[PDB]
Structure 1
């Protein structure tokens, strides 16, 4: 990794930085209202 970062094949002694590390998400979620409201269609189709 440090050879890749410095863009060479030989590196002298010392400390070298590189790309950061970041935790990827385990999975995915989606959220949306609750949702209580319902259009009154059971009354519509039971109309006498």
Structure 2
């Protein structure tokens, strides 16, 4: 209950981060799929492109 003059270490200071970033790449690759819609002509409803 009695403290004399001097320096004293009580606890430690930790800076806890508040946000997290886990993004590994800048962008992912693609596959050719726009030709399904970007086409010269389409198919009918009795025989449609799958």
Superposition TM-score, scaled by structure 2 size: 0.39
Aligned to 1:18: 10
Greater shift in the superposed pair: 34-43 or 14-23? 34-43
Does 1:41 find its partner at 2:33?
yes
Against the structure 1 CA distance between its residues 15 and 36, is the aligned structure 2 distance closer, same or farther, given a 3 Å change threshold?
A: closer
Superposition TM-score, scaled by structure 1 size: 0.40
**Stretches of structure 2 lacking an aligned partner (at least 5 in a row):** 41-50
**Stretches of structure 1 lacking an aligned partner (at least 5 in a row):** 1-8
The structure with higher relative contact order (CA 8 Å, sep 6+) is: 1
Structure with greater helix share of residues? 1
Find the aligned partners of 1:34 and 1:12 in 2 and give their Cα distance. 58
Q: CA RMSD in A?
A: 2.9
